Write a protein that holds these residues in place. Structure first.
Motif, PDB file in Angstrom:
ATOM      1  N   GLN C 238       0.807  -1.205   0.000  1.00  0.00           N
ATOM      2  CA  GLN C 238       0.000   0.000   0.000  1.00  0.00           C
ATOM      3  C   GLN C 238       0.845   1.261   0.000  1.00  0.00           C
ATOM      4  OE1 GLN C 238      -3.277  -0.534  -0.563  1.00  0.00           O
ATOM      5  NE2 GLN C 238      -2.378  -2.588  -0.654  1.00  0.00           N
ATOM      6  N   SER C 239       2.116   1.158   0.371  1.00  0.00           N
ATOM      7  CA  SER C 239       3.010   2.304   0.380  1.00  0.00           C
ATOM      8  C   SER C 239       3.818   2.338  -0.908  1.00  0.00           C
ATOM      9  CB  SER C 239       3.946   2.241   1.582  1.00  0.00           C
ATOM     10  OG  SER C 239       4.882   1.197   1.411  1.00  0.00           O
ATOM     11  N   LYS C 240       3.855   3.505  -1.547  1.00  0.00           N
ATOM     12  CA  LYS C 240       4.641   3.701  -2.755  1.00  0.00           C
ATOM     13  C   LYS C 240       6.050   4.177  -2.455  1.00  0.00           C
ATOM     14  CE  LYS C 240       0.640   2.963  -4.558  1.00  0.00           C
ATOM     15  NZ  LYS C 240      -0.587   2.737  -3.747  1.00  0.00           N
ATOM     16  N   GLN C 241       6.487   4.079  -1.209  1.00  0.00           N
ATOM     17  CA  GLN C 241       7.782   4.592  -0.800  1.00  0.00           C
ATOM     18  C   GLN C 241       8.700   3.429  -0.451  1.00  0.00           C
ATOM     19  OE1 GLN C 241       7.969   8.167   1.479  1.00  0.00           O
ATOM     20  NE2 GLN C 241       7.262   9.063  -0.450  1.00  0.00           N
ATOM     21  N   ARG C 242       9.891   3.757   0.035  1.00  0.00           N
ATOM     22  CA  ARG C 242      10.939   2.762   0.234  1.00  0.00           C
ATOM     23  C   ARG C 242      10.620   1.921   1.454  1.00  0.00           C
ATOM     24  NH1 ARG C 242      15.580   4.950   1.871  1.00  0.00           N
ATOM     25  NH2 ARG C 242      14.191   6.273   3.115  1.00  0.00           N
ATOM     26  N   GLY C 243      10.172   0.692   1.227  1.00  0.00           N
ATOM     27  CA  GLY C 243      10.230  -0.299   2.282  1.00  0.00           C
ATOM     28  C   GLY C 243      11.680  -0.614   2.563  1.00  0.00           C
ATOM     29  N   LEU C 244      12.082  -0.515   3.824  1.00  0.00           N
ATOM     30  CA  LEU C 244      13.509  -0.527   4.102  1.00  0.00           C
ATOM     31  C   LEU C 244      13.901  -1.380   5.299  1.00  0.00           C
ATOM     32  CD1 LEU C 244      14.439   1.838   6.550  1.00  0.00           C
ATOM     33  CD2 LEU C 244      13.260   3.216   4.852  1.00  0.00           C
ATOM     34  N   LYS C 245      12.983  -2.148   5.873  1.00  0.00           N
ATOM     35  CA  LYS C 245      13.354  -3.198   6.811  1.00  0.00           C
ATOM     36  C   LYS C 245      12.284  -4.271   6.778  1.00  0.00           C
ATOM     37  CE  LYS C 245      15.024  -4.258  11.399  1.00  0.00           C
ATOM     38  NZ  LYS C 245      15.615  -5.427  10.720  1.00  0.00           N
ATOM     39  N   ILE C 246      12.700  -5.516   6.563  1.00  0.00           N
ATOM     40  CA  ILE C 246      11.818  -6.675   6.610  1.00  0.00           C
ATOM     41  C   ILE C 246      12.339  -7.624   7.673  1.00  0.00           C
ATOM     42  CG2 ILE C 246      10.551  -8.311   5.229  1.00  0.00           C
ATOM     43  CD1 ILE C 246      11.614  -7.129   2.767  1.00  0.00           C
ATOM     44  N   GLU C 247      11.431  -8.197   8.456  1.00  0.00           N
ATOM     45  CA  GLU C 247      11.880  -9.134   9.479  1.00  0.00           C
ATOM     46  C   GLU C 247      10.802 -10.158   9.804  1.00  0.00           C
ATOM     47  OE1 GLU C 247      12.751  -7.537  13.252  1.00  0.00           O
ATOM     48  OE2 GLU C 247      13.889  -9.292  13.914  1.00  0.00           O
ATOM     49  N   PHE C 248      11.259 -11.385  10.076  1.00  0.00           N
ATOM     50  CA  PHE C 248      10.457 -12.590  10.242  1.00  0.00           C
ATOM     51  C   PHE C 248      10.482 -13.096  11.680  1.00  0.00           C
ATOM     52  CE2 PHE C 248      10.466 -13.184   5.695  1.00  0.00           C
ATOM     53  CZ  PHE C 248       9.295 -13.861   5.477  1.00  0.00           C
ATOM     54  N   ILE C 249       9.461 -13.881  12.026  1.00  0.00           N
ATOM     55  CA  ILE C 249       9.422 -14.672  13.254  1.00  0.00           C
ATOM     56  C   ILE C 249       8.707 -15.987  13.020  1.00  0.00           C
ATOM     57  CG2 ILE C 249       9.636 -13.106  15.218  1.00  0.00           C
ATOM     58  CD1 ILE C 249       6.382 -13.106  14.921  1.00  0.00           C
ATOM     59  N   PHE C 259       6.055 -11.611   9.069  1.00  0.00           N
ATOM     60  CA  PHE C 259       7.100 -10.663   8.715  1.00  0.00           C
ATOM     61  C   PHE C 259       6.511  -9.281   8.520  1.00  0.00           C
ATOM     62  CE2 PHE C 259       6.676  -9.745   4.156  1.00  0.00           C
ATOM     63  CZ  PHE C 259       5.864 -10.750   3.731  1.00  0.00           C
ATOM     64  N   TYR C 260       7.287  -8.268   8.869  1.00  0.00           N
ATOM     65  CA  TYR C 260       6.892  -6.897   8.586  1.00  0.00           C
ATOM     66  C   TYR C 260       7.843  -6.248   7.600  1.00  0.00           C
ATOM     67  CZ  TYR C 260      10.536  -4.646  11.426  1.00  0.00           C
ATOM     68  OH  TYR C 260      11.725  -4.186  11.929  1.00  0.00           O
ATOM     69  N   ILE C 261       7.277  -5.319   6.836  1.00  0.00           N
ATOM     70  CA  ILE C 261       7.999  -4.380   5.997  1.00  0.00           C
ATOM     71  C   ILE C 261       7.693  -2.999   6.550  1.00  0.00           C
ATOM     72  CG2 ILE C 261       8.261  -3.423   3.692  1.00  0.00           C
ATOM     73  CD1 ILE C 261       7.333  -6.069   2.592  1.00  0.00           C
ATOM     74  N   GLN C 262       8.666  -2.384   7.209  1.00  0.00           N
ATOM     75  CA  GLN C 262       8.445  -0.997   7.575  1.00  0.00           C
ATOM     76  C   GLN C 262       8.675  -0.121   6.356  1.00  0.00           C
ATOM     77  OE1 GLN C 262      11.011   0.382  10.644  1.00  0.00           O
ATOM     78  NE2 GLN C 262      12.606   1.089   9.252  1.00  0.00           N
ATOM     79  N   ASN C 263       8.042   1.037   6.340  1.00  0.00           N
ATOM     80  CA  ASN C 263       8.163   1.904   5.188  1.00  0.00           C
ATOM     81  C   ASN C 263       8.978   3.129   5.544  1.00  0.00           C
ATOM     82  OD1 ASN C 263       6.203   0.454   3.321  1.00  0.00           O
ATOM     83  ND2 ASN C 263       4.941   0.851   5.121  1.00  0.00           N
TER      84      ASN C 263
END
Lengths: 43, 218, 851
Positions: C238-249, C259-263
């Motif tokens: 939904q974000s057109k900007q730089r996703g710049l951290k992904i992390e799993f559990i 997992f999350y993708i912070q924007n």
RNA sequence: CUGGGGGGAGUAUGGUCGCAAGGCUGAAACUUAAAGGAA
């Protein structure tokens, strides 16, 4: 015939004979060949 | 769609400047561009038509697919320079046109050819240099020409010239356009290297004179 | 001199870095500027501010900005913190005793990631410059340097000893064999940059510039060149900007992964990945309508195996995140945002429903910050401190504890002051508003809407405090009195130009006002008399200060220099050039003619007004220093800046020939040692096998440079030069000539380095025996006779072997040229026209002759 | 539509009346910004 410069632009051709390609040169040899070209211009 | 525009009848439709299109053979009273966003562009001469395609995004995907290909098979040549197997390394450095890596694959394959034991490289490498076409062999002889100007790097050049001469057709090599300004350039270098190695092997017989003196010693 | 120093720094909770979470919710280690501070989420009190043991501003503090912390990373079990800084250094600390254990400089730019590996004893570090270095902690040594990326390491993932995989700020993801440290497989992940990387063992996930998130299948046990890591499909966010951290559990108690993708902006997109049972039982449903088209539909996977989740938003721009989980209904995620604040959210999920329309924050640590840059700082007599912000966060900190005890809401506020009894604050805002607050009661004594027509810019009390001056960008100044605790506008002086600083003298005498028209004007307060006009600054002019004797003024501006003026006649004294960006503020000391100036290039500077030296160059801030305030008595000075920081400052040689000779002696000693070993092996294999020699260990320098002795001698024989080669071969005696002949005799059995050094071997050998011919033919030994014969045969065979193909190529190439000529040269039978045709078609070269 | 000094070609000038040089600009009471010039 004597080895002039390259007829391309991603190539560097020394008068020794050793043609080098800019895509294959690492960045150390890119800086080194740029400084060496600066010396051969400055003289 | 906002600001660039099509014009007609130079002999051709031209867009705004960039991208002169194919055009026609003669003049033109025609533009119909008015499907959905800006879809099919009909552009018509006196008799002949063109139905110009779509939003021009097809080329960029093709344009972005080559760089990916080139950076993929640049990281195959480094693996081949690592682990040997010099034949696909040779033809792939010929495809990429990486000249000092081409000199390295030919020089180290030649050194191991001197090591072990009609054929002057490994036979898969010289059939791989036998099956290459006109553009590849003419650039290969461009840089055999400029390697031959040394007294150090000349042997690799001479043996590549030798395997080209004994694995290709000589009439074909003559009829390739460009290969008479190369062979004129590196016949006299081979002549001076022949005189130099002949002078070296004639001054090589002081070993034989020293042997016959050492035999006359007793 | 009684110099200055830094007592304490505060005002920052979360700065330009990441955050690591430690379990007991739990505590949190995060970055202040150049030092790390630990916080307990439960209450939020600052339980630790682990800092460097040297105060910035001391005698040995070096003349540059301090290294800003840029990556926190934590080893949980053995209790270590590996932190990395803006210059490239990595400090590893034990969190028990809070000292520095390891210093790991290594890099050349700022660093971007750390990771402990094999849980202890190994740390991998990726930096702005494209290197990625492995470090051991039991050896304090950079082991390996993986060096093939191009821009800046944005992420990696390693497993122990065999495979690393990095992705950088070019478009490229790379897989590294950590045994050979050569890059194995390189792809172009995204067409611009590549900012993300996470992997749960089967699938890998990356993100680039805008919403295109790419799933990859890494098959580690693959053998093909391209295909250790393949691409399996893309999807959207939904974000057109730089996703710049992904992390799993992997949450336990069934087994599940999130997992999350912070924007860039404000938003973390969370995702549940599903399980193989619903993969198998969801395949048929999109495989309905019954197969080339269905195979194309089944190939076009991402939305299949991945399931979006509760998209957690925030008030501000998001800088970093990390979570913990229990029960799959406690996805508890800590989040440090850019405007300094940490936030502990937690989304519940009943394993089918996420049970909320929008997630809920359970904690928020924001009290010790401002959310904006402090545009104005102030101080009490000596006890309290005033910080003025843009959101409204006026805050009254105290010096003796560094805690805000009182905070209000004003607006875009740029200047403020106290009131001379204490416990009372005047303030002016960006728009036409002025405001008054206190310390004991609530916020607003009163506001004055329409205090000015436009942006207020600077106010000043009189030394008794009953009368204050407000100058504003509506080209007016105004005077206000305190009537009884309310403000009384009585007079207003309209100028021709936007007044942007005011000041009075500290003895009620002068009113100096700085206009936008490159000048200041000094008035008499008792007459509005227009005493002086100081001119010649050449850009619009910021902060003024009047000295305690009311004789000497300072004048700062955006011309990067401060001017000292004598106020008796309005005559300039110095025009000293400081501060290469812009001097925002300048303030005297209480009783002296020394002064301070803080500027827009992250530096405060201490000067004297008699010699006009620079007493001190204080270098603790990281960005634009917006304000500073000196104590009324005693003289300790606070400075507050754009990096959300508020900090206190208080008082205190062989040559050729002999190189070849020693190389020849050790090389031939190794060579005949191995030949004696081989003769021993043949005798103890051809006789009664009861004994043999024990072992000749190879030479130290030969195994140190990894060379056979023929190669070692061959490269030192190469490394002598051609001008002193005939001297290097003439110096050596005949015993070294005999072992040189042994060296040549051995080297023309290895036919690889014979043919790569044929003219060098020929030149040296023929000069050697030509020079030593008289003694050589008088030696009587059949070993040397057979040696000379063997060298002669192999050397002449190599030379005739190379001139064979030389002569072959001469005759073949001139045949090729001649058959091209007789194919299509031209047609002249007449000899004169033929010779003129060849003279016109010859090769010309022009030479510079002398007559 | 009446009114006139004294030849031509030059040269010098410690006299009188003038006009004219310096020296990077900004930039001085300030050893001072940006920008420009020059090399």
């Amino acid at each position: 015939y004597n080895v002039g410069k390259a007829e391309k632009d991603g190539e560097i051709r020394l008068k020794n004979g050793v043609a080098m390609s800019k895509e294959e040169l690492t960045r150390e040899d890119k800086n080194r060949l740029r400084r060496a070209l600066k010396r051969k211009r400055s003289k | 769609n906002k600001q660039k525009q099509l014009i007609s009848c130079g002999a051709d439709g031209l867009i705004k400047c960039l991208k002169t299109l194919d055009g026609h053979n003669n003049r033109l009273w025609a533009l119909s561009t008015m499907n959905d966003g800006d879809m099919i562009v009909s552009a018509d001469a006196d008799g002949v038509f063109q139905f110009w395609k779509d939003c021009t995004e097809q080329e960029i995907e093709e344009e972005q697919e080559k760089a990916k290909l080139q950076v993929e098979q640049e990281q195959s040549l480094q693996n081949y320079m690592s682990k040997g197997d010099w034949t696909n390394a040779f033809l792939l450095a010929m495809t990429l046109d990486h000249p000092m890596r081409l000199f390295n694959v030919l020089k180290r394959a030649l050194g191991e050819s001197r090591s072990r034991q009609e054929v002057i490289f490994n036979e898969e490498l010289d059939q791989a240099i036998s099956i290459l076409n006109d553009e590849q062999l003419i650039l290969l002889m461009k840089r055999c020409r400029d390697w031959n100007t040394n007294a150090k790097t000349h042997t690799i050049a001479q043996r590549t010239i030798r395997c080209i001469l004994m694995h290709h057709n000589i009439a074909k090599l003559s009829e390739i356009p460009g290969m008479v300004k190369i062979v004129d350039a590196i016949i006299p270098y081979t002549q001076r290297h022949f005189t130099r190695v002949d002078n070296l092997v004639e001054q090589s017989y002081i070993l034989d004179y020293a042997l016959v003196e050492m035999d006359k010693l007793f | 001199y009684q110099r200055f120093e830094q007592a304490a720094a505060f005002g920052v909770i979360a700065s330009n870095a990441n955050c690591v979470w430690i379990p007991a919710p739990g505590q949190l280690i995060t970055s202040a500027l150049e030092d790390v501070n630990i916080w307990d989420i439960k209450t939020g009190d600052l339980v630790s501010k682990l800092s460097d043991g040297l105060p910035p501003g001391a005698s040995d503090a070096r003349g540059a900005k301090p290294a800003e912390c840029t990556y926190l990373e934590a080893h949980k079990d053995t209790d270590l913190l590996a932190v990395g800084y803006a210059d490239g250094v990595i400090k590893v600390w034990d969190l028990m005793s809070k000292t520095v254990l390891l210093n790991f400089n290594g890099h050349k730019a700022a660093i971007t990631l750390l990771q402990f590996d094999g849980t202890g004893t190994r740390l991998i570090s990726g930096s702005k410059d494209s290197n990625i270095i492995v470090w051991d902690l039991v050896g304090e040594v950079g082991l390996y340097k993986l060096r093939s990326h191009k821009d800046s390491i944005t992420g990696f993932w390693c497993q122990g000893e065999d495979w690393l995989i990095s992705t950088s700020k070019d478009g490229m993801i790379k897989l590294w064999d950590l045994k050979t440290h050569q890059c194995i497989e390189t792809h172009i992940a995204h067409t611009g940059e590549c900012w993300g990387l996470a992997v749960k063992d089967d699938l890998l996930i990356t993100t680039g510039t805008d919403s295109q998130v790419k799933i990859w299948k890494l098959d580690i046990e693959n053998d093909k060149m391209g295909g250790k890591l393949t691409e399996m499909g893309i999807f959207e966010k939904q974000s057109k900007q730089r996703g710049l951290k992904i992390e799993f559990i992997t949450n336990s108690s069934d087994k599940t992964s999130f997992f999350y993708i912070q924007n860039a902006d404000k938003t973390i997109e969370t995702f549940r990945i599903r399980k193989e049972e619903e993969i198998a039982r969801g395949l048929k449903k999109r495989e309905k309508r019954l197969l080339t088209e269905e195979e194309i539909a089944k190939s076009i996977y991402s939305s299949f195996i991945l399931h979006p989740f509760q998209t957690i938003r925030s008030l501000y721009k998001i800088k970093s995140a990390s979570w913990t989980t229990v029960s799959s209904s406690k996805l508890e995620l800590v989040l440090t945002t850019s405007s300094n604040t940490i936030e502990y959210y937690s989304i519940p999920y009943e394993k089918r429903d996420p049970t909320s329309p929008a997630p809920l924050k359970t904690h928020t640590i924001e009290l010790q910050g401002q959310r904006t840059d402090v545009r104005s700082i102030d101080i009490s007599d000596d006890n309290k401190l005033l910080a003025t912000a843009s959101n409204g966060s006026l805050k009254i900190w105290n010096i003796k504890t560094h805690k805000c005890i009182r905070t209000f809401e004003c607006g875009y506020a740029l200047t403020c002051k106290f009131l001379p009894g204490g416990l009372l604050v005047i303030l002016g805002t960006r728009n036409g508003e002025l405001q008054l607050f206190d310390l004991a009661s609530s916020s607003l004594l009163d506001t004055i809407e329409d205090a000015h027509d436009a942006a207020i810019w600077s106010l000043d009390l009189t030394s008794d405090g009953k009368r204050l001056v407000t100058g504003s960008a509506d080209k007016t100044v105004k005077f206000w009195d305190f009537k009884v605790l309310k403000l009384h506008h009585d007079t207003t002086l309209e100028l021709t130009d936007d007044i942007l600083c005011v000041r009075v003298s500290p003895d009620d005498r002068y009113l100096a006002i700085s206009l936008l028209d490159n000048t200041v004007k000094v008035f008499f307060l008792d007459s509005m008399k227009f005493y002086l006009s100081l001119y010649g600054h050449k850009l619009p002019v910021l902060s003024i200060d009047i000295s305690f004797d009311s004789k000497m003024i300072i004048t700062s501006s955006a011309d990067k220099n401060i001017k000292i003026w004598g106020l008796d006649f309005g005559d300039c004294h110095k025009s000293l050039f400081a501060h290469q960006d812009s001097i925002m503020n300048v303030k005297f000391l209480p009783q002296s003619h020394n002064f301070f100036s803080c500027s827009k290039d992250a530096v405060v500077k201490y000067w004297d007004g008699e010699k006009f030296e620079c007493i001190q160059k204080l270098y603790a801030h990281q960005s634009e220093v917006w304000a500073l305030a000196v104590a009324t008595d005693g003289g300790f000075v606070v400075s507050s800046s754009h990096d959300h920081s508020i900090r206190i400052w208080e008082e205190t040689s062989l040559k050729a020939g002999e190189r070849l000779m020693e190389a020849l002696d050790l090389g031939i000693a190794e060579i005949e040692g191995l030949e004696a070993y081989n003769r021993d092996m043949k005798l103890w294999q051809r006789k009664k096998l009861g004994e043999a020699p024990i072992k000749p260990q190879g030479n130290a320098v030969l195994i140190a440079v990894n060379k056979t002795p023929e190669q070692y001698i061959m490269d030192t024989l190469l490394r002598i030069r051609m001008s002193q080669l005939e001297d290097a071969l003439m110096v050596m005696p005949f015993s070294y000539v005999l072992k040189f002949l042994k060296f040549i005799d051995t080297v023309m059995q290895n036919k690889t380095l014979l043919h790569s050094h044929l003219p060098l071997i020929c030149k040296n050998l023929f000069f050697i025996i030509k020079f030593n011919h008289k003694e050589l033919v008088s030696q009587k030994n059949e070993e040397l006779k057979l040696q000379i014969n063997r060298v002669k045969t192999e050397l002449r065979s190599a030379l005739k072997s190379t001139e064979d193909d030389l002569g072959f190529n001469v005759q073949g190439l001139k045949f090729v040229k001649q058959q091209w000529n007789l194919r299509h040269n031209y047609e002249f039978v007449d000899e004169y026209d033929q010779q003129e045709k060849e003279s016109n078609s010859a090769r010309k070269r022009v030479f510079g002759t002398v007559i």
